[PDB]
Design an enzyme around this catalytic site. Structure first.
Site, PDB file in Angstrom:
ATOM      1  N   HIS A  40      72.350 -18.940  39.139  1.00  0.00           N
ATOM      2  CA  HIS A  40      71.986 -19.608  37.900  1.00  0.00           C
ATOM      3  C   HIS A  40      71.326 -18.631  36.925  1.00  0.00           C
ATOM      4  O   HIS A  40      71.177 -18.979  35.721  1.00  0.00           O
ATOM      5  CB  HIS A  40      71.155 -20.856  38.137  1.00  0.00           C
ATOM      6  CG  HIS A  40      69.697 -20.630  38.269  1.00  0.00           C
ATOM      7  ND1 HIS A  40      69.045 -20.546  39.464  1.00  0.00           N
ATOM      8  CD2 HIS A  40      68.747 -20.519  37.282  1.00  0.00           C
ATOM      9  CE1 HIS A  40      67.741 -20.372  39.235  1.00  0.00           C
ATOM     10  NE2 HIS A  40      67.539 -20.387  37.897  1.00  0.00           N
ATOM     11  N   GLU A  52      59.118  -1.577  38.152  1.00  0.00           N
ATOM     12  CA  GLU A  52      58.314  -2.201  37.121  1.00  0.00           C
ATOM     13  C   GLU A  52      57.001  -2.755  37.705  1.00  0.00           C
ATOM     14  O   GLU A  52      57.008  -3.381  38.767  1.00  0.00           O
ATOM     15  CB  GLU A  52      59.107  -3.377  36.521  1.00  0.00           C
ATOM     16  CG  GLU A  52      60.192  -3.000  35.576  1.00  0.00           C
ATOM     17  CD  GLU A  52      59.717  -2.479  34.219  1.00  0.00           C
ATOM     18  OE1 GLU A  52      58.529  -2.066  34.089  1.00  0.00           O
ATOM     19  OE2 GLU A  52      60.509  -2.464  33.268  1.00  0.00           O
ATOM     20  N   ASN A  54      54.110  -3.598  34.673  1.00  0.00           N
ATOM     21  CA  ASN A  54      54.024  -4.215  33.360  1.00  0.00           C
ATOM     22  C   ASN A  54      55.395  -4.100  32.702  1.00  0.00           C
ATOM     23  O   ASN A  54      55.859  -2.996  32.425  1.00  0.00           O
ATOM     24  CB  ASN A  54      52.957  -3.567  32.483  1.00  0.00           C
ATOM     25  CG  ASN A  54      52.693  -4.364  31.227  1.00  0.00           C
ATOM     26  OD1 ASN A  54      53.607  -4.846  30.578  1.00  0.00           O
ATOM     27  ND2 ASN A  54      51.421  -4.674  30.973  1.00  0.00           N
ATOM     28  N   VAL A  57      55.418  -2.402  29.121  1.00  0.00           N
ATOM     29  CA  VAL A  57      54.885  -1.066  28.954  1.00  0.00           C
ATOM     30  C   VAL A  57      55.666  -0.127  29.874  1.00  0.00           C
ATOM     31  O   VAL A  57      55.724  -0.396  31.063  1.00  0.00           O
ATOM     32  CB  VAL A  57      53.371  -1.036  29.279  1.00  0.00           C
ATOM     33  CG1 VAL A  57      52.762   0.352  29.173  1.00  0.00           C
ATOM     34  CG2 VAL A  57      52.627  -2.039  28.400  1.00  0.00           C
ATOM     35  N   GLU A  62      59.523   3.512  36.326  1.00  0.00           N
ATOM     36  CA  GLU A  62      60.710   2.672  36.158  1.00  0.00           C
ATOM     37  C   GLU A  62      62.003   3.455  36.378  1.00  0.00           C
ATOM     38  O   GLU A  62      62.139   4.659  36.104  1.00  0.00           O
ATOM     39  CB  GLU A  62      60.773   2.095  34.759  1.00  0.00           C
ATOM     40  CG  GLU A  62      59.554   1.244  34.386  1.00  0.00           C
ATOM     41  CD  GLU A  62      58.375   1.924  33.706  1.00  0.00           C
ATOM     42  OE1 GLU A  62      58.314   3.149  33.708  1.00  0.00           O
ATOM     43  OE2 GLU A  62      57.515   1.184  33.238  1.00  0.00           O
ATOM     44  N   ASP A  84      73.244 -20.980  45.482  1.00  0.00           N
ATOM     45  CA  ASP A  84      72.639 -20.320  44.316  1.00  0.00           C
ATOM     46  C   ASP A  84      72.291 -18.874  44.644  1.00  0.00           C
ATOM     47  O   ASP A  84      71.108 -18.511  44.787  1.00  0.00           O
ATOM     48  CB  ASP A  84      71.432 -21.127  43.786  1.00  0.00           C
ATOM     49  CG  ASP A  84      70.931 -20.607  42.447  1.00  0.00           C
ATOM     50  OD1 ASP A  84      71.651 -19.794  41.827  1.00  0.00           O
ATOM     51  OD2 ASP A  84      69.791 -20.944  42.070  1.00  0.00           O
ATOM     52  N   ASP A 171      52.915 -22.301  43.092  1.00  0.00           N
ATOM     53  CA  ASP A 171      54.360 -22.434  43.080  1.00  0.00           C
ATOM     54  C   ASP A 171      54.957 -21.249  42.328  1.00  0.00           C
ATOM     55  O   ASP A 171      54.260 -20.513  41.632  1.00  0.00           O
ATOM     56  CB  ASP A 171      54.808 -23.742  42.414  1.00  0.00           C
ATOM     57  CG  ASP A 171      56.229 -24.240  42.673  1.00  0.00           C
ATOM     58  OD1 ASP A 171      56.969 -23.602  43.464  1.00  0.00           O
ATOM     59  OD2 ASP A 171      56.617 -25.279  42.063  1.00  0.00           O
ATOM     60  N   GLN A 174      59.686 -21.095  36.136  1.00  0.00           N
ATOM     61  CA  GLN A 174      60.682 -20.477  35.258  1.00  0.00           C
ATOM     62  C   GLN A 174      60.322 -19.015  34.987  1.00  0.00           C
ATOM     63  O   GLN A 174      59.166 -18.688  34.744  1.00  0.00           O
ATOM     64  CB  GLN A 174      60.743 -21.211  33.916  1.00  0.00           C
ATOM     65  CG  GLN A 174      61.493 -22.534  33.948  1.00  0.00           C
ATOM     66  CD  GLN A 174      60.860 -23.641  34.762  1.00  0.00           C
ATOM     67  OE1 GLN A 174      59.647 -23.862  34.707  1.00  0.00           O
ATOM     68  NE2 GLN A 174      61.683 -24.389  35.488  1.00  0.00           N
ATOM     69  N   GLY A 175      61.331 -18.157  35.054  1.00  0.00           N
ATOM     70  CA  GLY A 175      61.147 -16.719  34.861  1.00  0.00           C
ATOM     71  C   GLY A 175      61.028 -15.981  36.201  1.00  0.00           C
ATOM     72  O   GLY A 175      61.205 -14.760  36.237  1.00  0.00           O
ATOM     73  N   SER A 177      62.864 -17.104  38.688  1.00  0.00           N
ATOM     74  CA  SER A 177      64.177 -17.402  39.184  1.00  0.00           C
ATOM     75  C   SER A 177      64.940 -16.129  39.575  1.00  0.00           C
ATOM     76  O   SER A 177      64.890 -15.143  38.834  1.00  0.00           O
ATOM     77  CB  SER A 177      64.992 -18.148  38.175  1.00  0.00           C
ATOM     78  OG  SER A 177      64.442 -19.436  37.938  1.00  0.00           O
ATOM     79  N   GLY A 178      65.630 -16.184  40.717  1.00  0.00           N
ATOM     80  CA  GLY A 178      66.409 -15.072  41.257  1.00  0.00           C
ATOM     81  C   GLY A 178      65.617 -14.081  42.109  1.00  0.00           C
ATOM     82  O   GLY A 178      66.199 -13.223  42.798  1.00  0.00           O
TER      83      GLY A 178
HETATM   84 CA   LIG Z   1      57.052  -1.070  32.755  1.00  0.00          CA
END
Ligand SMILES: [Ca+2]
Length: 223
Positions: A40, A52, A54, A57, A62, A84, A171, A174-175, A177-178
């Site tokens: 989804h 990652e 932040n 930033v 990264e 899913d 919990d 949203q965000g 997800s995955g």
């Molecule tokens: Ca960063």
């Protein structure tokens, strides 16, 4: 993540951010060329962001690598969210190091009651909206199949489990997800769905990764 904690930079080194101009979902690095996420979360033009903390930033650890291919499960049903799960291949291999590492797949499914680590950059509020910049974490137990089915009558398949706290307050959201649910060092779940976030009697529902290990291995062996 609602009711969680700041993980600490790069202490969840398999956690990725999927970016399409902005963070929109999590994922888990399972080897140097492959990420597992939720179906989804599918969209075109994904960049995978590894290493990652932040997400707003550039901190120095990264790796940004474009997706070369996305593969949604053949039986993914967006209406029920059954199956899913999606694989994302990277255009180039990640450089594995202390801060960018793969997470093992399961050989056997997780025990009910197992405390697992869920992580992501999703909403931190139940009621209202606040999205964190640094990675958040939550320790949450797998709930029994019976309590899961009672919470969501008619909607839980054998390819899903519930984890969290029936009393509310803690919990994924949203965000997130995955993103990963890691139990005993294995990727056992993917953040999939739930009614709201951190609400009484409405726990998080997660893709049951151990049902997918044959498809994952066959897919990675052919792509
Ligand atoms: Ca960063």
């Amino acid at each position: 993540i609602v009711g969680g904690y700041t993980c600490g930079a790069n202490t969840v080194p398999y956690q990725v951010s999927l970016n399409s101009g902005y963070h929109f979902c999590g994922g888990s690095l399972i080897n140097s060329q492959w990420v597992v996420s939720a179906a989804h979360c599918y969209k075109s033009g994904i960049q995978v962001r590894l290493g990652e903390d932040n997400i707003n930033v550039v901190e120095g650890n990264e790796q940004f690598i474009s997706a070369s291919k996305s593969i949604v499960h053949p039986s993914y049903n967006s209406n029920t969210l059954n199956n899913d799960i999606m694989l994302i291949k990277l255009k180039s291999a990640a450089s594995l190091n202390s801060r960018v590492a793969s997470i093992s797949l399961p050989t056997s499914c997780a025990s009910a009651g197992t405390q697992c680590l869920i992580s992501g950059w999703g909403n931190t509020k139940s009621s209202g909206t606040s999205y964190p910049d640094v990675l958040k974490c939550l320790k949450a137990p797998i709930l029994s199949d019976s309590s899961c089915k009672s919470a969501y009558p008619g909607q839980i398949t054998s390819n899903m489990f519930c984890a969290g706290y029936l009393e509310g307050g803690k919990d994924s959201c949203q965000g997130d997800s995955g993103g990963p649910v890691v139990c005993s060092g294995k990727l056992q779940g993917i953040v999939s769905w739930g009614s709201g976030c951190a609400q009484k009697n409405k726990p998080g529902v997660y893709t049951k990764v151990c049902n997918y290990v044959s498809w994952i291995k066959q897919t990675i062996a052919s792509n």
